[PDB]
Amino acid sequence: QSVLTQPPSASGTPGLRVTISCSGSSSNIGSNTVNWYQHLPGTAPKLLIHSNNQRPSGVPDRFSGSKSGTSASLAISGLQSEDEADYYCAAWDDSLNGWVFGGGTKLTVLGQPKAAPSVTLFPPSSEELQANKATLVCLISDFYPGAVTVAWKADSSPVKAGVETTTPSKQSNNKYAASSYLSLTPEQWKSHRSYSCQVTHEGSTVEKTVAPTE
Amino acid sequence: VQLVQSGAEVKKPGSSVKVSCKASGGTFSNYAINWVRQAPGQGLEWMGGIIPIFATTNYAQKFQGRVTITADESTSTAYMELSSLRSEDTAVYFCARDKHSWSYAFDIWGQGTMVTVSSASTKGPSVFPLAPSSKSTSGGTAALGCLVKDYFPEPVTVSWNSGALTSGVHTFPAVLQSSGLYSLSSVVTVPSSSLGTQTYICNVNHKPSNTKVDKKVEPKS
């Protein structure tokens, strides 16, 4: 666990304000300055605020920092979609004689329109079946918000065994993609009339069905 | 001044890894180099630091003599060595330079180095064609692709028709299976009218296993 406490999530409206808090103790925030970093996994963290409230050159005046007692806060005004990222506070800790980071806060900017997932389901290839395996591939794309649940069916019966699903990943167009794989034996594949992949997003379901080729 | 880190590492549990960080267009001067990691779905975690000119080091208590940080002033390169690797050590490792006038803030960061710790062994993928199927009948569109199955470690690259086909290509992030192996799929959205005449070949490269595979994707028959 992180020695500085931050809320795991925060959300704000485009053009408005959001505040991200950081709570510490007398040995860290109570005695030392606080720095803030913005991070998008896949790129290095970027310094936003140093020495409690100083902006490095290139950081817009929309970002401000403050410190009071054993707590610090980052305020973001005129929220832009580009501000969606993880925000971390950090301070030197005198008792540990080292740096401490907060657990980070994931900031969501509430502007974005909802988008239903596009679903493609592929049956096993004849080549894979000849190799004594059978993989059904369910590809899910262009959905927003970035969360889906996947349900597989053998004819009409639910199937939980042999299912591997990815976490959603942000696409170039800021919508999300995910995929789900169902591993079967050639016997199980050939024994049913069909298999289906059911994707549920914001309560609404999109289904695709595939069947063996005789 | 930029910080350039060494490439991705793939290690077995119990082994040791050494990551480098080279100052480019500058030196370490009297600044410190700090090491910070981020495990998947976790926050930033400080590991330790060094002030190269004074040879003083500081380490995070949670790493009890597992981390060693060193530097050589001659080539302006700092190193982090993490021993007795465990699955929990899989993470991106960053180096960063501190700035004393900015209350020791980390103003310059390296690009990061991915370290994967796994009991899996290198394996080239099995590539299977995904025969064209209807996508939109009204739009006259079809989806076809390739399944890149059971490989280790990441990454793989997929191209179509030796890079001549880019429009409508979507290569999905890989799934990491309970087996310890990865699988991904690459799908192309094409016109259904072209299927009887246009050739579709997926080219799969897996440099860690020195594997290069081509797979023709033809209409179902």
Numbering used by the authors:
A (entry chain B): 1 to 214
B (entry chain A): 2 to 222
What does the paper say about this structure?
The Plasmodium falciparum reticulocyte-binding protein homolog 5 (PfRH5) is the leading target for next-generation vaccines against the disease-causing blood-stage of malaria. A fundamental and non-redundant event in this process is the binding of P. falciparum reticulocyte-binding protein homolog 5 (PfRH5) on the merozoite to its host RBC receptor basigin (BSG) (Crosnier et al., 2011). Here, we examine a panel of human monoclonal antibodies (mAbs) to PfRH5, isolated from the first clinical trial of a PfRH5-based vaccine (Payne et al., 2017), to define critical mAb epitopes in atomic detail. We identified a subset of mAbs with neutralizing activity that bind to three distinct sites and another subset of mAbs that are non-functional, or even antagonistic to neutralizing antibodies.
